[PDB]
Structure 1
Amino acid sequence: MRILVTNDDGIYSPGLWALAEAASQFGEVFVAAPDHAITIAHPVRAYPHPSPPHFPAYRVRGTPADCVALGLHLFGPVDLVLSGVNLGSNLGHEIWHSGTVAAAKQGYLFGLSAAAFSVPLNGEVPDFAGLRPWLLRTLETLLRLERPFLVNVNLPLRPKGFLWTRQSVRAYEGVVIPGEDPMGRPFYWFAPRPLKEAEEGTDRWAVAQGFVSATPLRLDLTDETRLQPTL
């Protein structure tokens, strides 16, 4: 099988090459990563770029979705699109605005299977050598799914297991803190907080428990419980 690997962090992220290497154990790997929708207003420029295992690669001056569209052109046919490993979580409400997820979604929109990968972080750096067996296990599992699939994956720095999950959906409380710069000019701090603890079975909960979280995603944002007849 032929795999396109991309991301949101750009062609220099160590997360990108960790994903490329893991994927190479399952098929031929090609890389196209940024230097979130597909650019159509103007043309995009992309350039051959060296990998750090050698992977044919292009650094694209466009969005992660542009990378997918270009990658299909440069390396078609492609069977699977993998996006990440993003340095930083992509959990719950974060999925909406994730560039990493957008690339995987684009792949899905083109009729391919796809998955996004992110590692939640904060004060510690990802040890990709340590994460490798968990990446391979995850990939192995995703490749056993009925195709095509679209999955959002988050891996704790040091996994203890794997769980399929629902997206965490929590209400938020707005918090705004007025203030002023050392020069007296006014500004505002925003620190909205979730109203409750992440629920069991959710991506956020799973990661906090030390488990790899894999959430299957839907493309249809329609709330069918509110659809209406014509009046």
Structure 2
Amino acid sequence: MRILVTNDDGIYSPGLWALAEAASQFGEVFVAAPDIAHPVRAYPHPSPLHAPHFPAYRVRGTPADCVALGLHLFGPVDLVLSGVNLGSNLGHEIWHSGTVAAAKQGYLFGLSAAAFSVPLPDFAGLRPWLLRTLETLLRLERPFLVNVNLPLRPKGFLWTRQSVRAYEGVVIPGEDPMGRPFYWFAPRPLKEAEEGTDRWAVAQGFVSATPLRLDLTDETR
């Protein structure tokens, strides 16, 4: 099978290549990553030095643009991967993240897809977990759409649901050196993450894998 790999950190991020090398084990892989009708420019790009080779393009555009372009430039691909993104994509942030958006883009086109994030990393120690998460996802009924969060050093794997905690708008008064007054604003979650949630799995050293839907519509309502 043919896999397109992208990210939202860019063509020079190590996470990107960690994900690509991990993917190369299961299929031929191609890379397209950033460097209303809108224009999009892509340019051929050399893969990292001593790493395995990978046809690739640096794209002046969004992660989603990278997916549409990648599918157009790299012919027929069967799977879209996004990551490994540097930072975390847990709970509420998964619905306003460019990392989740590219995977969604892939799924909108009819392909299985998945996002990889790691709340901050050593990709040498994660390689095997990337490999093992990848072979798990590949047994799912296709097509699939999954958001994967890996802890720095995972000790397991759990299917999860997004943590939907409520927050408190903590707002404390302050002033900077020049005397000027201002207000500190720091949203704070109201409760510690619940068991079964991505955040709970991650905080416990478990790779978190969350099946996603395409939108936020409250159809029950």
- TM-score tier, shorter chain, comes to over 0.9
Classify the secondary structure of the residue corresponding to 1:86: strand
Deviations 1:92-138 (A, max 9, x none): 001011111110000001111000000111xxxx1101001100000
Q: 1:186 to 1:44 in 2, by over 3 A?
A: farther
Classify the secondary structure of the residue corresponding to 1:224: coil
Cα distance between partner residues in 1 of 2:184 and 2:37: 35
Deviations 1:39-95 (A, max 9, x none): x43311111111100111100011000000110011020100000001111000010
Cα distance between partner residues in 1 of 2:173 and 2:164: 28
Cα distance between partner residues in 1 of 2:115 and 2:60: 20
Cα distance between partner residues in 2 of 1:67 and 1:182: 44
Report the TM-score, using the length of structure 1 for normalisation: 0.92
**Root mean square deviation, CA, Å:** 1.1
Deviations 1:152-208 (A, max 9, x none): 000111110000000000010111233233223343322111111111010000001
Count of aligned pairs = 218
Does structure 1 residue 221 correspond to structure 2 residue 216? yes
2:171 to 172, 176, 179: 176
Regions of 4+ moved over 4 Å: none
Deviates more, 1:188-197 or 1:101-110: 188-197
Classify the secondary structure of the residue corresponding to 1:136: helix
Report the TM-score, using the length of structure 2 for normalisation: 0.96
Deviation at 1:25, TM superposition (A): 0.1
Cα distance between partner residues in 2 of 1:51 and 1:177: 48
Deviations 1:15-48 (A, max 9, x none): 000000000000010000011xxxx433111111
Aligned-residue sequence identity (percent) comes to: 100
Partner of 1:229: none
Cα distance between partner residues in 2 of 1:62 and 1:202: 32
Partner of 2:26: 26
Cα distance between partner residues in 1 of 2:93 and 2:173: 25
Does structure 1 residue 200 correspond to structure 2 residue 201? no
Classify the secondary structure of the residue corresponding to 2:154: coil
Deviates more, 1:173-182 or 1:148-157: 173-182
Deviation at 1:223, TM superposition (A): 1.4
Deviates more, 1:216-225 or 1:141-150: 216-225
